[PDB]
Amino acid sequence: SGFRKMAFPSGKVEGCMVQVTCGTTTLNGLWLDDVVYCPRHVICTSEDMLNPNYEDLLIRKSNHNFLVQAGNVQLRVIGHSMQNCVLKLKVDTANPKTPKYKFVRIQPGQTFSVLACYNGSPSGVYQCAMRPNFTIKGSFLNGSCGSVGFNIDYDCVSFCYMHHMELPTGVHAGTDLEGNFYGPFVDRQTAQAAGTDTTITVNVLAWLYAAVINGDRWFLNRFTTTLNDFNLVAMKYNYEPLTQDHVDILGPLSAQTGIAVLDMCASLKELLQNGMNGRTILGSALLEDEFTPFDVVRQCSGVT
Amino acid sequence: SGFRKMAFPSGKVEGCMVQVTCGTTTLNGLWLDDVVYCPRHVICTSEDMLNPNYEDLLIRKSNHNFLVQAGNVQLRVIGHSMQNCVLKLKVDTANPKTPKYKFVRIQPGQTFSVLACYNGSPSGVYQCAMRPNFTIKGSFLNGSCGSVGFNIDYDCVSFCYMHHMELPTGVHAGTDLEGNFYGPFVDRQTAQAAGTDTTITVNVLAWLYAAVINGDRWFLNRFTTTLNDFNLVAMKYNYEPLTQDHVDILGPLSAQTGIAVLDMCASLKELLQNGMNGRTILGSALLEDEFTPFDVVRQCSGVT
Ligand SMILES: *C(=C)CNC(=O)[C@H](CC(N)=O)NC(C)=O
Numbered sequence: 001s002g003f004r005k006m007a008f009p010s011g012k013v014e015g016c017m018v019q020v021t022c023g024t025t026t027l028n029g030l031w032l033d034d035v036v037y038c039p040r041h042v043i044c045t046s047e048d049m050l051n052p053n054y055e056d057l058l059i060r061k062s063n064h065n066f067l068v069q070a071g072n073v074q075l076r077v078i079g080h081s082m083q084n085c086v087l088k089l090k091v092d093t094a095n096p097k098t099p100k101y102k103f104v105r106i107q108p109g110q111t112f113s114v115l116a117c118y119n120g121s122p123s124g125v126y127q128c129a130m131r132p133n134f135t136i137k138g139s140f141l142n143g144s145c146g147s148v149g150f151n152i153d154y155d156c157v158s159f160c161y162m163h164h165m166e167l168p169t170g171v172h173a174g175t176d177l178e179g180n181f182y183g184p185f186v187d188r189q190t191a192q193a194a195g196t197d198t199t200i201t202v203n204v205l206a207w208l209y210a211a212v213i214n215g216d217r218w219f220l221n222r223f224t225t226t227l228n229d230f231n232l233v234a235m236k237y238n239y240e241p242l243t244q245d246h247v248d249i250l251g252p253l254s255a256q257t258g259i260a261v262l263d264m265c266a267s268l269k270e271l272l273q274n275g276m277n278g279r280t281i282l283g284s285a286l287l288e289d290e291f292t293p294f295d296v297v298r299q300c301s302g303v304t
Numbered sequence: 305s306g307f308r309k310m311a312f313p314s315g316k317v318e319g320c321m322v323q324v325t326c327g328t329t330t331l332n333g334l335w336l337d338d339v340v341y342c343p344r345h346v347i348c349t350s351e352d353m354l355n356p357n358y359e360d361l362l363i364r365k366s367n368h369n370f371l372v373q374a375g376n377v378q379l380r381v382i383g384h385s386m387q388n389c390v391l392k393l394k395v396d397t398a399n400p401k402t403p404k405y406k407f408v409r410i411q412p413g414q415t416f417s418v419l420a421c422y423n424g425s426p427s428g429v430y431q432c433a434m435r436p437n438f439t440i441k442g443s444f445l446n447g448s449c450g451s452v453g454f455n456i457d458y459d460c461v462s463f464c465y466m467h468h469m470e471l472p473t474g475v476h477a478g479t480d481l482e483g484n485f486y487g488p489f490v491d492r493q494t495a496q497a498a499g500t501d502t503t504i505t506v507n508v509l510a511w512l513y514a515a516v517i518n519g520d521r522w523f524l525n526r527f528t529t530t531l532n533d534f535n536l537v538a539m540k541y542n543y544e545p546l547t548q549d550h551v552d553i554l555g556p557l558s559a560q561t562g563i564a565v566l567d568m569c570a571s572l573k574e575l576l577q578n579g580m581n582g583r584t585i586l587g588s589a590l591l592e593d594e595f596t597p598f599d600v601v602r603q604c605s606g607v608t
């Protein structure tokens with residue numbers, strides 16, 4: 001029993017973190033096989049970041065200008081290329097700790113673990129969600145660029161995020177491991193405002209299911225609703241619309257608890273309209289939306 | 305910027321987890337050098353747990369009755385002893401991934417990372433606090449016994465917790481790595497009720513400091529207080545008394561922010577008396593107490 005915001009064990013990713021230095025910029029890289037992946041703004045000064053022409057800046061860089069350090073041992077860079085907003089540094093040594101991996105581009109509402117790193121060294125691990133506005137609310141200080149987000153399926157690390165940017169509002173933006181930003185963000189120090197940070201409805205409902213499973217039941221009401229009626233309330237509270245796809249995904253939690261998904265929607269509707277009245281659910285005074293239905297099943301079943 | 309409930313990177317501890325089986329009971333063990341540490345109730349049936357005599361149960365067990373599996377390779381047990389509520393299984397092979405380590409017994413209010421494990425395999429990592437009533441609010445399913453809590457100082461793992469027990473209220477109890485329970489708990493399936501779960505005041509104040517540092521300032525008021533006046537309010541709200549030792553520990557966060565500790569106490573006093581009025585601090589609708597002053601400095605400074 002108990003339900004915690006839980007990250008994947010980070011060891012497999014710790015084994016991939018390196019330091020990348022280009023001139024006076026140092027950030028983190030991800031060493032998989034004989035390639036080190038890092039944000040392309042490693043080639044920039046803070047001055048460059050105001051208006052960088054990356055192709056032009058890269059012309060001035062050779063293999064020997066990229067200093068890659070894995071622990072306290074230097075890797076030899078034998079090639080470099082830009083893919084979208086990442087650099088791929090080819091090194092002469094395959095990372096011996098390379099886990100089975102994939103590169104995945106996640107959808108908004110999907111959760112992942114971040115291994116916060118500085119100078120190629122892990123500082124901490126925490127659980128994030130891709131917000132509906134394609135930001136993440138992370139903990140990223142100067143030097144954290146190139147820290148990665150990931151999911152693990154048994155022995156396979158799916159890398160979904162690399163950290164690039166803090167917006168002036170202090171929310172975070174980054175790329176998948178092909179270098180494509182999530183959302184409309186660019187790797188430039190300019191005015192970039194996030195859209196509406198809506199609540200990930202399917203994730204709130206999953207977490208209400210987790211609550212019932214762990215004995216927090218006070219919010220369960222006598223009502224049901226429809227998707228259309230629920231969605232009217234959801235829109236009013238800046239919640240994402242719930243689709244039949246979301247209802248289908250919640251099916252196993254519905255089955256386990258014997259609470260129809262639309263009944264849990266009606267409970268959620270009353271919590272939106274009535275508030276918590278100073279009560280908590282799983283030790284929270286607000287409705288948690290950074291657990292996916294898959295997260296709740298995993299944590300409630302003990303998957304390793 | 306951003307402030308997250310952050311666990312230590314778990315790789316160093318992942319490298320220590322093994323499966324221990326005795327008859328039909330399987331749980332987790334911690335393999336450090338040539339010793340595997342696990343809860344002594346590995347020798348119990350669920351029937352035994354109602355009223356176990358551990359010394360008597362252990363007489364019936366030989367080295368070959370303890371099955372220790374590290375990955376999918378069996379370790380040879382060459383000795384066993386009971387220390388308090390843990391078994392120490394001497395094995396013929398030193399764990400080659402043994403990190404620098406220490407065993408520490410933490411105080412209430414101290415935070416630590418848990419690596420939740422099943423069948424010797426890590427499922428997740430999360431951040432916990434030793435509650436003032438010597439429980440932790442964890443996420444622990446059947447099979448999680450022997451999962452450990454730890455802090456890391458650069459390269460040295462300080463193990464502070466091993467999981468033994470879920471109380472009927474669904475909060476958790478366990479031992480240090482010498483086998484001594486935190487609090488009054490015993491490894492028996494009997495009526496064990498927790499005392500008052502008070503709020504860790506020094507940790508709330510640390511987190512209010514983290515909030516100011518990350519730009520959440522709305523709760524900062526025009527007032528100051530004294531320790532004695534604050535403590536009267538703290539008692540009324542089931543907050544731990546604040547001591548001058550706590551004020552001293554908050555000194556560096558006081559210095560960084562320029563907010564006197566007693567001024568932040570007066571802000572906290574108003575939040576207790578007035579509530580949040582539907583506002584959030586660092587994305588929380590309640591006052592967070594599972595960040596120590598050391599945690600806040602570490603996360604705000606980027607220690608690796
Ligand atoms: C993202 C991490 C960009 N890096 C930085 O701004 C700092 C400053 C620098 N000298 O590169 N890097 C570190 C390691 O603090």
Ligand SMILES: *C(=C)CNC(=O)[C@H](CC(N)=O)NC(C)=O
Nearest residue numbers: 328329330331423446447448449
């Ligand atoms: C604490 C983990 C005690 N272990 C258990 O109760 C279960 C049941 C068993 N067969 O040992 N262990 C597991 C691995 O589920």
